[PDB]
């Protein structure tokens, strides 16, 4: 409960994700954080440093669900 699985944390914010989205490279970030990076004119994946083969941010629903089950089952709220 007190150790958040690394997979639920945003590579950019280092924070537990509320709205996980996935970019064409297959990595997942919080929506706001990856947006700020793209809006600054970088069209590359922060984690793989490979250039992003598109910009659509599709939601990672299965991940959002798993984060909710982990949150409910340990007592954490998801601000």
């Amino acid at each position: 409960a007190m150790i958040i699985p690394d997979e639920f944390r945003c590579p950019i914010s280092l924070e537990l994700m509320q709205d996980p989205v996935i970019v064409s490279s297959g990595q997942t970030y919080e929506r706001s954080c990856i947006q700020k990076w793209l809006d600054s004119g970088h069209k590359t994946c922060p984690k793989t440093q490979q250039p992003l083969s598109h910009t659509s941010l599709t939601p990672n629903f299965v991940l959002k669900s798993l984060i909710s089950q982990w949150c409910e089952a340990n007592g954490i709220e998801l601000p």
Partner: protein, 149 residues
């Protein structure tokens, strides 16, 4: 404000699994300034060396790379006498997903396998490619002069 949160939480991560040959942490309670210690790698001509390093975080960290410099004098073809480190991660190939930990690790990979192809001190790169034994020796002497102790 987001930058401060991301720094404090990156600090906690380093404390749990600290980087390999390196120790780092804040200067007092000013949280945007860190000093860090690197042990000279074994294979390198900096072995047995203790090198100090300042880390200064931008206001828009992590979206802007941190400022990182040697405060200990070194004989390296990609480090200069004012401490400036020429490494791509700190300038062009920075990413919002890199951490101080990953930077320190790169500085270690640097001391061990330097890049002659892009110098910041061409003299030392010239020596590294012309007379490597002149370099290793000059390095070990600078190490013992300024870094051992």
């Amino acid at each position: 404000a987001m930058a401060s949160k991301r720094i404090l939480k990156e600090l906690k991560d380093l404390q749990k699994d600290p980087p390999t040959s390196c120790s780092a942490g804040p200067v007092g309670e000013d949280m945007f300034h860190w000093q860090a210690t690197i042990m000279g790698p074994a294979d390198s001509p900096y072995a047995g060396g203790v090198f100090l390093v300042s880390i200064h975080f931008p206001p828009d960290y992590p979206f802007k790379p941190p400022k990182v410099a040697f405060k200990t004098k070194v004989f390296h073809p990609n480090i200069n006498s004012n401490g400036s480190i020429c490494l791509d991660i700190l300038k062009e190939q920075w990413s919002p997903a890199l951490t101080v930990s990953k930077v320190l690790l790169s500085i270690c990979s640097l001391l061990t396998d330097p890049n002659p192809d892009d110098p910041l001190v061409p003299e030392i790169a010239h020596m590294y490619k012309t007379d490597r034994a002149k370099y290793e020796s000059t390095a070990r002497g600078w190490t013992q002069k300024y870094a051992m102790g």
